[PDB]
Paper text:
Alkaline phosphatases (EC 3.1.3.1) hereafter referred to as APs, are widely distributed enzymes that hydrolyze the phosphate monoesters under alkaline pH conditions. Recently we reported extraction of an AP, termed SPAP, from the bacterium Sphingomonas sp. strain BSAR-1, exhibiting several unique features, such as constitutive expression, thermo-lability, extracellular release and high specific activity. SPAP requires Ca2+ and Zn2+ for activity, while magnesium has no effect. In conclusion, three dimensional structure of a substrate-bound alkaline phosphatase (SPAP) from the Sphingomonas sp. strain BSAR -1 bacterium has been determined to a resolution of 1.95 Å.
The final contents of the asymmetric unit are: 526 protein residues (31–556), two zinc ions of partial occupancy (0.75), 278 water molecules, 5 glycerol molecules, 1 Ca2+ ion and one organic phosphate in the active site. The overall shape of the protein can be described as that of a shallow cup with a thick base. The two active-site metal ions (M1 and M2), which were identified as Zn2+ through X-ray fluorescence measurements, are 4.1 Å apart. Zn2+ ion at M1 site is in coordination to polar atoms from His 491, His 304 and Asp 300, while Zn2+ at M2 site is coordinated by His346, Thr89, Asp345 and Asp49. Structural superposition confirmed the catalytic residue in SPAP as Thr89, which was also suggested by sequence alignment. Unaccounted electron density was observed in the active site region, and the volume of this density is larger than that for an inorganic phosphate, and therefore, we have interpreted this density to represent a phosphomonoester, ROPO3, substrate. One of the nonbridging phosphate oxygens, O3, is sequestered between the two zinc ions, while the remaining two, O1 and O2, interact with residues Thr89, Arg173, Asn110 and Lys171 in the active site. In SPAP, the corresponding torsion angle is −60°, and the hydroxyl of Thr89 is pointing toward the phosphate, thus confirming that the present structure is not a product complex, but is a Michaelis complex relevant to the first stage in which the phosphoenzyme is formed. The residues Thr155 and Glu322 in ECAP are replaced by Ala174 and Gly295 respectively in SPAP. These changes abolished the third metal coordination site, and therefore there is no third metal bound to SPAP inthe active site. Interestingly, a lysine residue is recruited into the active site of SPAP, and the position of this residue is such that the positively charged NZ atom almost overlaps the water molecule coordinating the Mg2+ ion in the ECAP structure.
Author numbering:
A (entry chain A), B (entry chain A): 31 to 556
Amino acid sequence: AARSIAATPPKLIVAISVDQFSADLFSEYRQYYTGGLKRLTSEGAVFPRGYQSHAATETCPGHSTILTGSRPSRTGIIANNWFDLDAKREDKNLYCAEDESQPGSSSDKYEASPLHLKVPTLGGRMKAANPATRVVSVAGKDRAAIMMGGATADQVWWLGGPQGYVSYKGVAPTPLVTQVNQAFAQRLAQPNPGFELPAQCVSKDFPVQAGNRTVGTGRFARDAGDYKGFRISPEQDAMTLAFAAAAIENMQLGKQAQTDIISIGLSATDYVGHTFGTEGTESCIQVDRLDTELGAFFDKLDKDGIDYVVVLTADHGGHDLPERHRMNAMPMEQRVDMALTPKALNATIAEKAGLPGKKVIWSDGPSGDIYYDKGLTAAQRARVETEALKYLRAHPQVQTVFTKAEIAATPSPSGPPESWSLIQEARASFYPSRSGDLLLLLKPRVMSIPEQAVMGSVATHGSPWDTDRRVPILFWRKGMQHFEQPLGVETVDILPSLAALIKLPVPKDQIDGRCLDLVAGKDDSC
Amino acid sequence: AARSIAATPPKLIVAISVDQFSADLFSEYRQYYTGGLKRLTSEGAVFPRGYQSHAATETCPGHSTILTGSRPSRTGIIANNWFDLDAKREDKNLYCAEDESQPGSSSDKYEASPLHLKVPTLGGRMKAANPATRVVSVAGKDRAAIMMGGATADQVWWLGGPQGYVSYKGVAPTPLVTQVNQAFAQRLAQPNPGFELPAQCVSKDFPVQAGNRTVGTGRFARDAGDYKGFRISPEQDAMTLAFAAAAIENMQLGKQAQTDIISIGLSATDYVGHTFGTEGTESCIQVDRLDTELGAFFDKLDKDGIDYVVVLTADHGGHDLPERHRMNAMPMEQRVDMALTPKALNATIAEKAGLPGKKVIWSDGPSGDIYYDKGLTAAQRARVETEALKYLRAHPQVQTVFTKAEIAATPSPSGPPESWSLIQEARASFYPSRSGDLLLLLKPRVMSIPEQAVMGSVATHGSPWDTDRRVPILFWRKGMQHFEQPLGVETVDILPSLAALIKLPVPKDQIDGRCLDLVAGKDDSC
Ligand SMILES: [Ca+2]
Ligand SMILES: [Ca+2]
Ligand SMILES: [Zn+2]
Ligand SMILES: [Zn+2]
Ligand SMILES: [Zn+2]
Ligand SMILES: [Zn+2]
């Protein structure tokens, strides 16, 4: 049994990103794991304080770091959406994982593509070193699959809707995929009675009102054919893992001479967290199912005799809805002023700049990147920068605003990510040609979803604060020596850590991360 | 069974401080608790990210916050030792828990006293409101017992050495105490074979060299009569808990009309952490024994039918020795330059100020408070401040140095403790008449114990960084509703939280902490 994680190159790397699986949520339920998460935390190399270190704590930037060893300042994936005011097409909003150069495309109707990603992934690097490498990537969300797989992946599949898993335009379903989609279709057509509460979820079972919604007691009961219900539930993760297992077996991943790699993006935790917040029965059930399904997944790989190493992490952390925080000893938790949402803020700034009724800024939400309209004249732009800063810095819920020049002037951060300044975090997701003219950051404990009568999502991530940056990073291979390392590491450290195990050279000057030693005690895998 | 923590006033408050039980160490072993810590974490109000929020993360300042609702800036307990250069006696170094006005006293031979503590404790406040209140405080260290009990406590006992538990000068052992000390004497006179490793400790069993010492594989085997061995082991915590249980029963605490309070300072985790670091078999065994002994302690109270509420926390966090960190993926971990220790630094600064061979500064260690010698003339003092700052700020291991005026100019901090600036942390343990003229803070991951041939302690706390500030805070009462709140709270919040349960008014302007709601969901104990 006892065997060093670096004894020989693993034959399969399994990289799992659990979307919105924050270190807080991970740590809370840690004492109840009995399945796959138990395996990882009791036997693996455990870094409970990993960091998606940059400020833009969203899915695309986060997934772009996991298998690239690169911060969003290098991957170019600085948000889920960014503005290119010089874009040919009408819609200046660009989706992180689209090819906007395609005719008749818009951010609402896009063609999936890894074109925006500026660097190779680990799979891309492995394939460059050895053409026989298979690189597979499956996920619940296109952006997760696409950013982990990279431009040279062999198979990139994601959940497209009620039809099941799909890929890039032109890519026909393989027999495995049609079989998976048949099973998915059969599961979807059946009602789901829901889940009774795990023992640990009983305490979380109370209703919380937020606008017209009540959350906190959901059990994922759903009607037949309810695709939205299926998506926002543990069912989609179970299906994604079954798909991954089927692909692993069908392609004989890890059964050939070279090392293969499969990346797996489990999206459910994130839909659940947005829809219900993170401390109710919904997230609790979801994490317990995650533990159980991961256990079954690992058991199947074991039974197949595959020599695999697993890394499991998240694309970012998350934060509970203010309404429940206020019931659980956090009375200062609040929702962002509606005055800071795109329409309102532009109108306000216009009127302050003396350009009332005009369009002087573009923004995507009540925080993050803000862009000055290109039409503005030099003097107009100057009045906009002055007035925007003056108004924002005076707002009670605003922590700070950085100018583009201030961020650019900041050196790429180094040292412990848990103690970075806000501008260092900003610099880590700064890419001059895509980033805003200003960066707006809200105070801690301000949720960037305004209070509304009719609400959709009640909770979100995307802030520069610790809840949203901190994520677990867990490495495991059969027989290795467990250790726990509570000091801060970055998700950009993942690539060089894995590369060391398979003796794949990676030029240090092409990445941001550093190699994490995965061998407890004297010997060093780096 | 089901019953709100605020349904009625508890009859007994049990406050437990586990010395150096950092949130990191607490979180690491959380999945293995089966005893008293399991009870607290699965059934209680769990705040896994509590903060000893100030910069001076030492035992005395930490214990001074737990039952006072007050930061060290208000308690006046700003360190374990501070200089009073105007003191009458020769030794200008004052111990936090002594009365230096006593003749022939020195910091090496002092008379224990709570005189330095500027504010009442919860016990003191309860007794002020109701004279029938019993206030008891027992600990492994005098400073823990003294600071949690306060000046009006009925019984304050601490481990004095091979003779067992002692109190203030003049206080005779009671029959209970002589009985406890008899049992302790019997335990001490027996060899201890040591402990075999709990399953979770097996992975930690490898040797680590630090100077002339090897740590990482200890099992607490000890010879008969080895008091040092007894002190640096789980044995002392077992004895302290048995003493507490015996006192509770003997005095019928919680069995009368009024609420009584007992504070318990379990010191072993801290001795073990200093002596061996925090990630080896020694700390692992110690935490497992802690869990088991706490379980037996709570079971005895339950069997006695006592209506008690428990709060459990730590006086500060802690940090592993650099030598093991470097083996476990933290290669940048290092020991502080010897040049920064008291003797050396003074000599250096003297020579830079043009007062070579003189005594221009006083300091206690390679970080923290520095004091200018009173003998210095205005101009001399000015050259010292200039040269000290210049030299320190240039040193590669120094994060920053604050002047006294800079800290004084800082308002008492508010808002989330996890995101305070360093000067805010400094302000939180700043007390003008006791604090230094300068405050020296080392960079993250610099251990403030220099590398030496012959070493004693290999690891310590006392830094302004997150490992040393972050501590668990756990509240429990039979039948309450469990909840977990991962956002940052302060240990100064403990007093008003407990006071709310027993309907004891506490003027907000006399404390720094705020009341934490301990009732999950809609109802609020505050
Ligand atoms: Ca409540
Ligand atoms: Ca090693
Ligand atoms: Zn995400
Ligand atoms: Zn999300
Ligand atoms: Zn201590
Ligand atoms: Zn200590």
